[PDB]
Amino acid sequence: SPVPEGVRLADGPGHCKGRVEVKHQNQWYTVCQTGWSLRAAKVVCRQLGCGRAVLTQKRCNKHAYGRKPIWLSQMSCSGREATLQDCPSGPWGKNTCNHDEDTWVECEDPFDLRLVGGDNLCSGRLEVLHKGVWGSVCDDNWGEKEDQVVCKQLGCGKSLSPSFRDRKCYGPGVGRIWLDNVRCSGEEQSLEQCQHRFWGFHDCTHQEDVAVICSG
Amino acid sequence: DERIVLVDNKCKCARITSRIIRSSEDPNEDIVERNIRIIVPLNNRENISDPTSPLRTRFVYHLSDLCKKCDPTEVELDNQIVTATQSNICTETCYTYDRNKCYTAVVPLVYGGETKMVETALTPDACYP
Amino acid sequence: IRVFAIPPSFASIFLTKSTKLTCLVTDLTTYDSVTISWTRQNGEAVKTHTNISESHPNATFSAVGEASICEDDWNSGERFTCTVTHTDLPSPLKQTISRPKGVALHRPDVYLLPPAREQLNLRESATITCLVTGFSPADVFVQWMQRGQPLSPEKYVTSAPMPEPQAPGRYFAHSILTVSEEEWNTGETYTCVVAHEALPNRVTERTVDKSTGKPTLYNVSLVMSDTAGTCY
Amino acid sequence: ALHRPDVYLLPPAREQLNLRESATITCLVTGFSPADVFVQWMQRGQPLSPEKYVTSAPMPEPQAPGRYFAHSILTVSEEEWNTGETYTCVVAHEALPNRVTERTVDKSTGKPTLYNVSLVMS
Amino acid sequence: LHRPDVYLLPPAREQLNLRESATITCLVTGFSPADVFVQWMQRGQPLSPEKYVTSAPMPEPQAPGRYFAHSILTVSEEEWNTGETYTCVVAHEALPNRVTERTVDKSTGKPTLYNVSLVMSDTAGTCY
Amino acid sequence: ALHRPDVYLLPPAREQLNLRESATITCLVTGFSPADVFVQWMQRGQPLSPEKYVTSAPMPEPQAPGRYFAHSILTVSEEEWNTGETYTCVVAHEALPNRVTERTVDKSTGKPTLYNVSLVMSDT
Ligand SMILES: *[C@@H]1O[C@H](CO)[C@@H](O[C@@H]2O[C@H](CO)[C@@H](O)[C@H](O)[C@H]2NC(C)=O)[C@H](O)[C@H]1NC(C)=O
Ligand SMILES: [Ca+2]
Ligand SMILES: [Ca+2]
DSSP: OOOOOOBOOBSSSTTSEEEOEEOOSSSOEEOOOSSOOHHHHHHHHHHHTOOOOOEEEEEOOSSOOOOSOOOSSOOOOOSSSOSTTSSOOOOSOSOSOOSOOEEEEEOOOOOEEEEEESTTSSSEEEEEEETTEEEEEOOTTOOSHHHHHHHHHTTOOSBOOOTTTSGGGSOOOOSOEEEOSOBOOSOOSOGGGSBOSOTTOOSOOTTSOOBOOBOO | OOOEEEEEOSSSOEEEEEEEEOOSSOTTOOEEEEEEEEEEESSOBSOTTOTTSOBOOOEEEESTTTSOOOSOEEEEOSSBEEEEBSOSOOOOOOOSEETTSOOEEEEOOEETTEEOOEEEEOSSSSOOO | OEEEEEOOOHHHHHHHOOOEEEEEEEEESOTTSEEEEEEOSSSOEEOOEEEEOOOOTTSOEEEEEEEEOOHHHHTTTOOEEEEEEETTOSSOEEEEEOOOOOOOOBOOEEEEEOOOTTTGGGSSOEEEEEEEEEEBSSOOEEEEEETTEEOOGGGEEEOOOEEOTTSTTOEEEEEEEEEOHHHHHHTOOEEEEEEOTTSSSSEEEEEEOSSSSOOSEEEEEEEEESSOOEEO | OOBOOEEEEEOOOHHHHHHTSEEEEEEEEEEEBSSOOEEOOEETTEEOOGGGEEEOOOOBOSSSTTOEEEEEEEEEEHHHHHTTOOEEOOEEOTTSSSSOBOOEEOSSOSOOOBOOOEEEOO | OBOOEEEEEOOOHHHHTTTSEEEEEEEEEEEBSSOOEEEEEETTEEOOTTSEEEOOOEEOSSSTTOEEEEEEEEEEHHHHHHTOOEEEEEEOTTSSSSEEEEEEOSSSSSOSBOOEEEEEEOTTOOOO | OOBOOEEEEEOOOHHHHHTTSOEEEEEEEEEEBSSOOEEEEEETTEEOOTTSEEEOOOEEOSSSTTOEEEEEEEEEOHHHHHHTOOEEEEEEOSSSSSSEEEEEEOTTTTOOSBOOEEEEEEOO
16 A cells, blocks of 8 residues: 655645645545544644644535545544554555545644844844744743743853843834743743743733843 | 642732541541632722822622633644633722732922923832833 | 434534535335435435445334535525435425524523532432523533543433523523542542534533532631732 | 432522522432333422423433433522522332432531631731 | 832821921932932922922941931921822932832821721632 | 920831831921030930931021921831830920920830721622
């Protein structure tokens, strides 16, 4: 049986949304396996690295030009397993695609962060990308532990504890306060891996923002 | 370690903890305890952002509006991810000040005739500009 | 011969994300000469999916036939009908289905009732109750969870909506979950997820636990000071 | 195999009363066989009208085969519930000794509480 | 740079008995250097430069390098008995926002009695 | 002419004592003429060094012409003050009949009389 070389998610806005297109040896075709739970969508999203699977559904075919043939094996995958290579597949046989429907999948935008307002980077206001928008992080709880996690992710070195005397050189923000009550205990790898309140809910003002100055 | 914090309000300085004590040995005869700790200010006034407001000598503490959850949570349904409303009940008065917050005011300053309004710090230290 | 055609409720639409139509046929003799057909309002044919189940004690056969049409056509108000032909029946049967229109939307309330005190003294089992009420129309989906993982369906039973005697145009339903007594005394947590069309976010959640219930003691403490004008 | 059913009453939800519209009284009866049960609602020894409660239907218990169960709910006014009126859920089953069993709850139904109030003056 | 501290002392109890006038003092201490600017107000109305006096800063014998000064304001006995409010405003470089203010009246600052009322309802509500 | 000075002693502020650092007292002498005033301090009947209190020169009073006023400031450790000691201010002027007048302040100066408190518990 063919081994998937990759997934591309064509016919969708960007490459984190669209129709599931398994790369068959040489020419590739669309797949409509039954029991398409979110577990397989999570592995599909992890193939591209977009982020977390949010939704999967099969859409009615009304002159959608589904020229791509269909596969002949199932892909029962536990979701916590590795790439599509390491999940069992049926021994060829017939297809489970009775109703002619395309499989849809909706991944999420990847995370990103930066410092704005500081010279030669490694300093300034904190902006985090989510839902395709940048925003500020509240300073209600900003311990020294929460400062070093941001610094190493951008490779700016250990923070030098600049206090608030030089934190007035960046000013306030205008964007939405995405994060609040951030509590980072361990190093982890990303700020999103910490415990926060929620995306979009806060009790802060643009005057109270977070400024992080690393070594550089 | 044996107590779990339910609410940690700062405006009303209210804190509620619950704990189960293994009294006797029958599992059906263990008491459930609810502790409430309230600190009331005797010098703060009606409006904490206006020094001219009169003094406050009446405090009301509703426990139904204190132990309330108002933040959508994520729920997995094996086919999608949705946001769920915790409560349907969701202008509250702040009795005391908050350390994590800054309180400022506008005051007229006269000198040589000209009047320059300047931002003040009602709180002793709080945060810095 | 009896033919039942159930429409797809919004509860199925929420989870399956697919609108399918089923025409249950009961008391069938010859399954080699039957045809489950689905047609539109003009006469166009729709591709069907007929599956024959196993045998029955009363020497009858059950026919299950799915027809799939996406929600854009169905929610617009178009009418469908089911036809079952049999060589023993001189005339094919006609059963039509469609979704009603013109009903107001009222937000439902969620109530969780802890187990009775007189039940846990037997050291046998407990019973938690999830109550949803005052909603229109009569469509509701209730599912129980524990630690973020769905429970086995058998552990709980959900009933059909029933009218409310004291308020016209409003309904209610119930859900019952059974758990061990030692599990409840340990302090595990449970969750009742309820979905209805009239909700602001379409999904609501409540949680019950032994610790956060009715407390025997209320150790209230009040401290008065003339200098503590701020709280961290 | 005739079995004696067990009747359990549920006191109304406190938040429902807090919002001050009505109250919900549940009569949960399980563990009877065969499927033959009749529940009624009486107040102060006087049976209420059939239009006051809604009666469920027998349906098998998935956990223990051969057992059926149902329930009945009666809505009461908030002022009527607060005034101290009593309610009961009389049940009838052939397997019962006297064919009549009763469970009764009230507002006072519960466990006595305590209040360890402390008023610190400094 | 040292942040100064401000305290107000209410008029003496045995001064009001004569029913002549009341005196309020604004003590600012612990600052360097020795240039301060104190202005009195009455419920948002700046007061005249003549009703209050101020003293030049003097060294503190206890801690060298920190100074102090005070401003004295007089008021009518009936005006203070009515319950009017007064404010003390000090300007110095050491402050974060560079200006601070404090407020005193009859009910606050060495009062006669304390009247408190407390209500605690919905003590058996839903917590979850 | 001559006039009788009046002596007022003011206790330390509550907010300063809450910081548990130090306490200060004030001895206000006013309504007197001419400018010749000699003020000391005492503690349990014995005098203290002149390095622990500071006095000011007379300044004309804008309100009543021909009247002067002066002030003295003394520093006290909050813990000592909280022990319960007594402090005395002595003012010496030529217009007073006996040339000497004294005032005393304690920790208990300004303690309130009534603490009316009521509590309501409505389990509604
Ligand atoms: C308590 O004081 C605040 C501050 O004065 C009041 O809110 C301010 O109202 C003025 C106009 O009257 C605005 O210029 C300010 O922007 C407001 N403050 C804020 C933070 O927005 C408030 O109304 C007062 N409360 C009461 C009950 O009088
Ligand atoms: Ca802050
Ligand atoms: Ca916060």
